[PDB]
Ligand binder design. Structure first.
Ligand SMILES: Nc1ncnc2c1ncn2[C@@H]1O[C@H](C[C@@H](N)CC[C@H](N)C(=O)O)[C@@H](O)[C@H]1O
Ligand SMILES: [Zn+2]
Ligand SMILES: [Zn+2]
Lengths: 122, 291
């Protein structure tokens, strides 16, 4: 973890640095805070309480945020993290790299579900 | 074993009333560890089971509930317990956490450094401590316990509660005796960490006045006597059904009262978990620059 975390301090593009790293076979960041939940939630991406369905796992938000985890400035225009203090649902098949998943996906706006992983707006 | 399905074991009055010497703690399942589902830190089960037991206690649960979590960090630089507290507590609860070392958490406010640097401007409603210092006789310890004892006497709302981690060697005479100023108290040991002398000293509903006269050194001897007497099997079966895990939204009222106005009705309401007495301003918690 100390490896990839220090790696994104050597770049102006932490997102691409992390994604390129795991895409090249590097080990994803571990120690994400995986919650225990009744798989009976709504399945939206980010939520005030856990909302995993049977096909998801819920994580503590700060622990799956690259910027929180590496203690680097968040890119959001408001300066406030979109995950920290909230819970993030990850598709079950992507639990190997929740930090990469969040860096690679976007929740819908007219709808709170991951685009491509629950958002049925098209 | 119904106790397999409970979140843990609570020290009974059967052992609180004993009079024995402090002995070594000898646990039959020592060096054993409960397995966790892949990716789940053990402290997730431990904190969940603590919250599950507190769900059976008369906790005061107001709007804008003021929670401080000491010793929230880990060598991994994460805070699983704080995330459990976020899952458990009302959405409008304010979580402040603290640790000597850097970490990232889902708390509303996170303060690094010795807990003694943590300045509580206003009284809080619930204190959770997992603070533990790994560094011949087993005498009462000072450490962060001096700070926590003072916090209870000054910065805890009437009706507020605490859950403070102790072990065989990490404990405090003064902190046991402060439990006598709550309406009820116990030591709670999670099933998930049953093979450890760890327990959570619980004070439920602070009264600011002595309800029970406790000899703190003798009571720690009774705690160890209880642990030595009581089979506890590793287990997390209590975590199988989480449909009622969240803390009840009790809407507990917050009142400002002078000491002279606190009559038998008020004591009774505090003691039933139905009232808090403290300011209702906005909470201010910050790092003080010491020495
Ligand atoms: N005096 C202190 N002030 C603040 N934190 C302390 C102090 N003494 C010990 N600690 C913290 O006690 C913590 C003990 C840990 N086992 C806590 C684990 C953590 N509760 C979790 O959710 O995993 C360590 O991170 C210590 O740094
Ligand atoms: Zn973040
Ligand atoms: Zn949509």
């Amino acid at each position: 973890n100390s490896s990839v975390l220090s790696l994104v301090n050597f770049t102006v593009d932490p997102q691409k640095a992390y994604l390129d790293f795991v895409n090249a076979g590097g080990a994803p960041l571990t120690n994400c805070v995986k919650m225990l939940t009744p798989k009976t939630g709504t399945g939206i991406a980010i939520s005030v309480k856990p909302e995993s369905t049977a096909d998801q796992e819920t994580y503590g938000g700060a622990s799956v945020c690259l910027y929180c985890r590496a203690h680097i400035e968040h890119p959001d225009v408001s300066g406030v993290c979109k995950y920290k203090g909230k819970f993030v649902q990850i598709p079950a098949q992507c639990v190997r790299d929740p930090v990469g998943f969040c860096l690679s996906n976007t929740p819908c706006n007219v709808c709170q579900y991951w685009i491509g992983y629950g958002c049925n707006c098209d | 074993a119904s106790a397999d399905w409970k979140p843990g074991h609570a020290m009974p009055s059967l052992f609180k009333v004993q009079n024995v010497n402090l002995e070594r703690c000898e646990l039959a399942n020592y060096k054993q560890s409960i397995p966790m589902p892949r990716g789940v830190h053990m402290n997730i089960a431990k904190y969940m089971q603590l919250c599950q037991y507190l769900n059976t206690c008369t906790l005061a649960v107001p709007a804008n509930m003021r929670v401080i979590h000491f010793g929230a960090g880990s060598d991994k630089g994460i805070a699983p317990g704080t995330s459990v507290l976020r899952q458990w507590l009302p959405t409008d609860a304010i979580i402040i956490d603290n640790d000597l070392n850097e970490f990232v958490s889902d708390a509303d406010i996170t303060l690094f450094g010795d807990c003694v640097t943590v300045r509580v401007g206003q009284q809080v409603d619930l204190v959770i401590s997992d603070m533990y210092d790994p560094t011949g006789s087993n005498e009462s310890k000072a450490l962060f316990f001096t700070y926590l004892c003072n916090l209870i006497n000054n910065n805890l709302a009437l009706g507020g509660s605490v859950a403070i981690k102790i072990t065989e060697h990490s404990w405090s005479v003064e902190l046991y005796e402060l439990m006598g100023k709550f309406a009820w108290w116990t030591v709670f040991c999670t099933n998930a960490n049953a093979s450890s002398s760890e327990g959570f000293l619980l004070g439920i509903n602070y009264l600011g006045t002595i309800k029970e006269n406790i000899d703190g050194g003798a009571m720690h001897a009774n705690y160890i006597f209880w642990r030595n007497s009581t089979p506890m099997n590793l287990s997390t079966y209590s975590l199988f059904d989480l449909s009622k895990f969240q803390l009840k939204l009790k809407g507990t009222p917050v009142l400002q009262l002078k000491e002279s106005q606190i009559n038998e009705l008020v004591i009774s309401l505090l003691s039933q978990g139905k009232l808090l007495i403290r300011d209702n301003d906005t909470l201010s918690v910050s790092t003080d620059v010491l020495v």
